[PDB]
Scaffold this active site. Structure first.
Site, PDB file in Angstrom:
ATOM      1  N   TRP A   1      16.376  62.189  41.407  1.00  0.00           N
ATOM      2  CA  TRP A   1      16.019  61.700  40.076  1.00  0.00           C
ATOM      3  C   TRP A   1      16.723  62.434  38.932  1.00  0.00           C
ATOM      4  CZ3 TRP A   1      14.881  57.098  39.193  1.00  0.00           C
ATOM      5  CH2 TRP A   1      14.194  56.317  40.145  1.00  0.00           C
TER       6      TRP A   1
ATOM      7  N   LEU B   1       8.850  49.412  47.682  1.00  0.00           N
ATOM      8  CA  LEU B   1       9.729  50.377  48.332  1.00  0.00           C
ATOM      9  C   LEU B   1       9.025  50.974  49.553  1.00  0.00           C
ATOM     10  CD1 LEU B   1      12.168  52.376  48.486  1.00  0.00           C
ATOM     11  CD2 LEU B   1      10.875  53.810  46.861  1.00  0.00           C
TER      12      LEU B   1
ATOM     13  N   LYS C   1      14.375  61.806  55.073  1.00  0.00           N
ATOM     14  CA  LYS C   1      15.790  61.829  55.422  1.00  0.00           C
ATOM     15  C   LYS C   1      16.672  61.276  54.302  1.00  0.00           C
ATOM     16  CE  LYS C   1      14.387  61.282  60.218  1.00  0.00           C
ATOM     17  NZ  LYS C   1      14.537  62.743  60.408  1.00  0.00           N
TER      18      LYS C   1
ATOM     19  N   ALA D   1      15.287  56.762  50.897  1.00  0.00           N
ATOM     20  CA  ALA D   1      14.785  56.137  49.674  1.00  0.00           C
ATOM     21  C   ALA D   1      15.850  56.159  48.565  1.00  0.00           C
ATOM     22  CB  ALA D   1      13.454  56.728  49.217  1.00  0.00           C
TER      23      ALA D   1
ATOM     24  N   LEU E   1       1.814  44.019  40.902  1.00  0.00           N
ATOM     25  CA  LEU E   1       1.107  43.612  42.112  1.00  0.00           C
ATOM     26  C   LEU E   1       1.150  44.724  43.165  1.00  0.00           C
ATOM     27  CD1 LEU E   1       2.622  40.031  42.303  1.00  0.00           C
ATOM     28  CD2 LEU E   1       0.416  40.712  41.288  1.00  0.00           C
TER      29      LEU E   1
HETATM   30  C1  LIG Z   1      18.650  48.417  36.626  1.00  0.00           C
HETATM   31  C2  LIG Z   1      18.121  48.216  38.074  1.00  0.00           C
HETATM   32  C3  LIG Z   1      17.525  49.543  38.600  1.00  0.00           C
HETATM   33  C4  LIG Z   1      16.680  49.277  39.881  1.00  0.00           C
HETATM   34  C5  LIG Z   1      16.037  50.575  40.470  1.00  0.00           C
HETATM   35  C6  LIG Z   1      14.937  51.095  39.533  1.00  0.00           C
HETATM   36  C7  LIG Z   1      14.293  52.367  40.201  1.00  0.00           C
HETATM   37  C8  LIG Z   1      13.249  51.973  41.284  1.00  0.00           C
HETATM   38  C9  LIG Z   1      12.588  53.268  41.779  1.00  0.00           C
HETATM   39  C10 LIG Z   1      11.628  52.923  42.934  1.00  0.00           C
HETATM   40  C11 LIG Z   1      10.265  52.425  42.362  1.00  0.00           C
HETATM   41  C12 LIG Z   1       9.354  52.152  43.581  1.00  0.00           C
HETATM   42  C13 LIG Z   1       7.939  51.655  43.156  1.00  0.00           C
HETATM   43  C14 LIG Z   1       7.115  51.502  44.394  1.00  0.00           C
HETATM   44  O1  LIG Z   1       7.332  50.700  45.300  1.00  0.00           O
HETATM   45  S1  LIG Z   1       5.861  52.671  44.551  1.00  0.00           S
HETATM   46  C15 LIG Z   1       5.407  52.507  46.324  1.00  0.00           C
HETATM   47  C16 LIG Z   1       6.285  53.460  47.105  1.00  0.00           C
HETATM   48  N1  LIG Z   1       6.055  53.268  48.536  1.00  0.00           N
HETATM   49  C17 LIG Z   1       5.202  54.016  49.251  1.00  0.00           C
HETATM   50  O2  LIG Z   1       4.549  54.961  48.756  1.00  0.00           O
HETATM   51  C18 LIG Z   1       5.117  53.603  50.698  1.00  0.00           C
HETATM   52  C19 LIG Z   1       4.937  54.778  51.717  1.00  0.00           C
HETATM   53  N2  LIG Z   1       5.949  55.830  51.463  1.00  0.00           N
HETATM   54  C20 LIG Z   1       7.220  55.605  51.802  1.00  0.00           C
HETATM   55  O3  LIG Z   1       7.546  54.513  52.341  1.00  0.00           O
HETATM   56  C21 LIG Z   1       8.244  56.678  51.530  1.00  0.00           C
HETATM   57  O4  LIG Z   1       7.519  57.897  51.422  1.00  0.00           O
HETATM   58  C22 LIG Z   1       9.068  56.514  50.228  1.00  0.00           C
HETATM   59  C23 LIG Z   1       9.988  55.313  50.383  1.00  0.00           C
HETATM   60  C24 LIG Z   1       8.136  56.250  49.008  1.00  0.00           C
HETATM   61  C25 LIG Z   1       9.854  57.785  49.969  1.00  0.00           C
HETATM   62  O5  LIG Z   1      10.683  57.958  51.128  1.00  0.00           O
HETATM   63  P1  LIG Z   1      10.693  59.390  51.852  1.00  0.00           P
HETATM   64  O6  LIG Z   1       9.342  59.992  51.706  1.00  0.00           O
HETATM   65  O7  LIG Z   1      11.211  59.177  53.226  1.00  0.00           O
HETATM   66  O8  LIG Z   1      11.623  60.288  50.931  1.00  0.00           O
HETATM   67  P2  LIG Z   1      13.289  60.339  50.985  1.00  0.00           P
HETATM   68  O9  LIG Z   1      13.690  61.622  51.665  1.00  0.00           O
HETATM   69  O10 LIG Z   1      13.791  59.113  51.578  1.00  0.00           O
HETATM   70  O11 LIG Z   1      13.515  60.470  49.435  1.00  0.00           O
HETATM   71  C26 LIG Z   1      13.080  61.518  48.591  1.00  0.00           C
HETATM   72  C27 LIG Z   1      13.207  61.077  47.156  1.00  0.00           C
HETATM   73  O12 LIG Z   1      12.404  59.871  46.930  1.00  0.00           O
HETATM   74  C28 LIG Z   1      11.694  60.136  45.743  1.00  0.00           C
HETATM   75  N3  LIG Z   1      10.478  59.316  45.815  1.00  0.00           N
HETATM   76  C29 LIG Z   1       9.395  59.505  46.629  1.00  0.00           C
HETATM   77  N4  LIG Z   1       8.482  58.525  46.372  1.00  0.00           N
HETATM   78  C30 LIG Z   1       9.055  57.701  45.415  1.00  0.00           C
HETATM   79  C31 LIG Z   1       8.602  56.535  44.794  1.00  0.00           C
HETATM   80  N5  LIG Z   1       7.385  55.997  45.108  1.00  0.00           N
HETATM   81  N6  LIG Z   1       9.387  55.937  43.868  1.00  0.00           N
HETATM   82  C32 LIG Z   1      10.618  56.450  43.570  1.00  0.00           C
HETATM   83  N7  LIG Z   1      11.075  57.597  44.153  1.00  0.00           N
HETATM   84  C33 LIG Z   1      10.281  58.208  45.081  1.00  0.00           C
HETATM   85  C34 LIG Z   1      11.379  61.625  45.766  1.00  0.00           C
HETATM   86  O13 LIG Z   1      10.986  62.115  44.480  1.00  0.00           O
HETATM   87  C35 LIG Z   1      12.715  62.111  46.216  1.00  0.00           C
HETATM   88  O14 LIG Z   1      13.630  62.246  45.112  1.00  0.00           O
HETATM   89  P3  LIG Z   1      13.938  63.662  44.410  1.00  0.00           P
HETATM   90  O15 LIG Z   1      12.592  64.166  43.886  1.00  0.00           O
HETATM   91  O16 LIG Z   1      14.476  64.465  45.545  1.00  0.00           O
HETATM   92  O17 LIG Z   1      14.819  63.400  43.188  1.00  0.00           O
HETATM   93  C1  LIG Z   2       3.237  50.668  44.165  1.00  0.00           C
HETATM   94  N1  LIG Z   2       1.884  50.133  44.279  1.00  0.00           N
HETATM   95  C2  LIG Z   2       1.254  50.457  45.564  1.00  0.00           C
HETATM   96  C3  LIG Z   2      -0.050  49.709  45.616  1.00  0.00           C
HETATM   97  C4  LIG Z   2      -0.811  49.927  44.293  1.00  0.00           C
HETATM   98  N2  LIG Z   2      -2.162  49.370  44.488  1.00  0.00           N
HETATM   99  C5  LIG Z   2      -2.346  47.968  44.826  1.00  0.00           C
HETATM  100  C6  LIG Z   2      -3.275  50.199  44.368  1.00  0.00           C
HETATM  101  N3  LIG Z   2      -3.036  51.508  44.280  1.00  0.00           N
HETATM  102  C7  LIG Z   2      -3.984  52.445  44.157  1.00  0.00           C
HETATM  103  N4  LIG Z   2      -3.630  53.769  44.037  1.00  0.00           N
HETATM  104  C8  LIG Z   2      -4.663  54.811  43.947  1.00  0.00           C
HETATM  105  C9  LIG Z   2      -3.825  56.085  43.917  1.00  0.00           C
HETATM  106  C10 LIG Z   2      -2.439  55.688  43.459  1.00  0.00           C
HETATM  107  C11 LIG Z   2      -2.204  54.194  43.828  1.00  0.00           C
HETATM  108  C12 LIG Z   2      -1.240  53.964  45.050  1.00  0.00           C
HETATM  109  C13 LIG Z   2       0.286  53.795  44.870  1.00  0.00           C
HETATM  110  N5  LIG Z   2       1.520  53.654  44.818  1.00  0.00           N
HETATM  111  C14 LIG Z   2      -5.357  51.919  44.099  1.00  0.00           C
HETATM  112  S1  LIG Z   2      -6.858  52.723  43.926  1.00  0.00           S
HETATM  113  C15 LIG Z   2      -7.819  51.289  44.034  1.00  0.00           C
HETATM  114  C16 LIG Z   2      -6.977  50.138  44.182  1.00  0.00           C
HETATM  115  C17 LIG Z   2      -5.586  50.524  44.250  1.00  0.00           C
HETATM  116  N6  LIG Z   2      -4.506  49.645  44.391  1.00  0.00           N
HETATM  117  C18 LIG Z   2      -0.184  49.068  43.196  1.00  0.00           C
HETATM  118  C19 LIG Z   2       1.336  49.364  43.124  1.00  0.00           C
HETATM  119 MG   LIG Z   3      14.013  58.988  54.370  1.00  0.00          MG
END
Ligand SMILES: CCCCCCCCCCCCCC(=O)SCCNC(=O)CCNC(=O)[C@H](O)C(C)(C)COP(=O)(O)OP(=O)(O)OC[C@H]1O[C@@H](n2cnc3c(N)ncnc32)[C@H](O)[C@@H]1OP(=O)(O)O
Ligand SMILES: CN1CCC(N(C)c2nc(N3C=CC[C@H]3CC#N)c3sccc3n2)CC1
Ligand SMILES: [Mg+2]
Length: 411
Positions: free
Chosen positions: A5, A159, A168, A171, A411
């Site tokens: 970031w 994501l 790894k 992301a 959403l």
């Molecule tokens: C103009 C167009 C632009 C379009 C792009 C706009 C930007 C979109 C940005 C995305 C908006 C998404 C909105 C949603 O969907 S938020 C929902 C995110 N998804 C989850 O939480 C699902 C379960 N978790 C995972 O699948 C993984 O843990 C994820 C994929 C989240 C990280 O994978 P992993 O754990 O295997 O890590 P890495 O080793 O690959 O990567 C490490 C780096 O990733 C940074 N990180 C961790 N979590 C997030 C996060 N939620 N947003 C942005 N960055 C995140 C972290 O600070 C680190 O960077 P740095 O601190 O080292 O710098």
């Molecule tokens: C990227 N998003 C993941 C699902 C999130 N959504 C759908 C949600 N999240 C809740 N989260 C409570 C802690 C942080 C956040 C999770 C994340 N990320 C909660 S708490 C009650 C409902 C609810 N829904 C909406 C957008």
């Molecule tokens: Mg990874």
């Protein structure tokens, strides 16, 4: 601290965000021609995949990735289980760009390993009202109003990296490739939300919940009987009574929205959203897409008396897998979506939303304190959760605002 970031055009610290006065881009102007035409490099064992969202099977593969690997709560008790019908709805709104859905697959077996999605949104994201005031005071009005026009940008969601591929650095590669694909369509900003704190949100709001089925919520430890219920002879009975709702809506004139309502709903919604600093602008086709009822996905009711739509509310369903329990394997949650009230108090409108959601078998109603959501929290017995949703822009400098000045539902 942030190896990815720190390289990106986002505000790097809270201070920076608190100093910002005017909306506008962070990075240098670029053209489509400047952007690489070839996908970002990826390891030879993986490949980029663009899923077809109008293919049931492609939707299915995304669904399973998210079912097993998407967001959990902090206790690993619940994992979101967005349905396939919900994913088609969310991923394919009017004029969506197929190339903005980005996946990574393992080349050999073609196992889906990671995903991110972008969809179009038209967003008001110009300088907030209280900064346009400081600006006028200052003789700085023209600069404050430069980016007032609604902008066609990207909203990022879903994501997800497979649990076996975590930490790894996959992301960042997904984010880079998504950015490239968006940039190649001449779009330079994105809006995204997350539960985690990253650099750097422009707004943050708590989550709220309203119990509809307290018996079940207690069983699955979504909820615990709070301490003051112990001084009762039958705590559970008192809890159930506390959250009881009418069996049928109270507003005369309430019915489900139908296609013919789309113009009036668009008008009353646009009038309402207009008043917030950051908010979407919807076409009739987008009102149709996001608000007309869809079975199991989105539920929308209008108040029409006298052949006139004066009010409406919408909610959408996201179930969660209940990881630990086994009397129950799903939490069925209704989320407050868009609404507008012109004829009745908002608390009276949303009470009908809870009545309807409970009638249809939802366990809980969730929302963030955006829009005017705070106005009905106490009367309608919502409680604050532990979580916050943080709002972010990519490539857009923006003053810190309160969540009650945000009108974008994510959403
Ligand atoms: C103009 C167009 C632009 C379009 C792009 C706009 C930007 C979109 C940005 C995305 C908006 C998404 C909105 C949603 O969907 S938020 C929902 C995110 N998804 C989850 O939480 C699902 C379960 N978790 C995972 O699948 C993984 O843990 C994820 C994929 C989240 C990280 O994978 P992993 O754990 O295997 O890590 P890495 O080793 O690959 O990567 C490490 C780096 O990733 C940074 N990180 C961790 N979590 C997030 C996060 N939620 N947003 C942005 N960055 C995140 C972290 O600070 C680190 O960077 P740095 O601190 O080292 O710098
Ligand atoms: C990227 N998003 C993941 C699902 C999130 N959504 C759908 C949600 N999240 C809740 N989260 C409570 C802690 C942080 C956040 C999770 C994340 N990320 C909660 S708490 C009650 C409902 C609810 N829904 C909406 C957008
Ligand atoms: Mg990874």
């Amino acid at each position: 601290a942030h190896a990815f970031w720190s390289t990106q055009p986002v505000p790097q610290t809270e201070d920076e965000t608190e100093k910002i006065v005017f909306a506008g881009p962070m990075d240098e102007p670029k053209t489509v021609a400047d952007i690489p035409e070839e996908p970002y490099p990826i390891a030879s064992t993986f490949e980029w995949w663009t899923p077809n969202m109008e293919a049931a099977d492609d939707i299915h593969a995304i669904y399973e990735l998210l079912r097993d690997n998407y967001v959990e709560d902090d206790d690993s008790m619940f994992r979101f289980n967005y349905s396939e019908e919900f994913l088609q709805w969310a991923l394919c709104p009017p004029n969506y760009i197929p190339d903005w859905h980005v996946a990574v697959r393992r080349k050999a077996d073609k196992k889906l390993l990671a995903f991110i999605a972008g969809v179009p949104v038209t967003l008001r994201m110009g300088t907030p009202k209280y900064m346009k005031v400081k600006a006028q005071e200052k003789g700085e009005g023209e600069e404050a109003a430069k980016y007032d026009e609604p902008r066609h940008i990207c909203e990022i969601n879903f994501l997800c990296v497979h649990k076996q591929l975590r930490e790894k650095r996959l992301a960042p590669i997904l984010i880079k490739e998504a950015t490239r694909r968006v940039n190649r369509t001449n779009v330079w900003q994105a809006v995204y939300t997350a539960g985690v704190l990253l650099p750097t949100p422009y707004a943050s709001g708590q989550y709220f919940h309203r119990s509809l089925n307290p018996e079940k919520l207690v069983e699955i430890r979504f909820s615990g009987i709070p301490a003051q219920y112990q001084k009762f002879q039958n705590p559970m009975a008192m809890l159930k009574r506390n959250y009881q709702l009418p069996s049928a809506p109270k507003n005369s004139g309430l019915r489900e929205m139908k296609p013919s309502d789309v113009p009036q709903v668009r008008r009353i919604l646009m009038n309402y959203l207009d008043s917030f600093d950051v908010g979407p602008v919807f076409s009739d086709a987008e009102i149709s897409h996001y608000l007309l009822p869809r079975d199991g996905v989105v539920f929308t009711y209008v108040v029409e008396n006298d052949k006139k739509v004066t009010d409406f509310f919408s909610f959408y369903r996201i179930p969660s897998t209940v990881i630990g329990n086994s009397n129950y394997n799903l939490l069925n949650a209704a989320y407050v979506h868009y609404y507008a009230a012109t004829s009745i108090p908002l608390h009276q409108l949303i009470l009908d939303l809870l009545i309807v959601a409970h009638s249809r078998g939802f366990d809980v109603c969730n929302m963030v304190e955006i829009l005017d959501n705070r106005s009905f929290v106490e009367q309608l017995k919502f409680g604050a959760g532990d979580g916050h949703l943080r709002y972010y822009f990519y490539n857009w400098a923006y003053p810190k605002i309160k969540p009650s000045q945000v009108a974008l539902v994510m959403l």
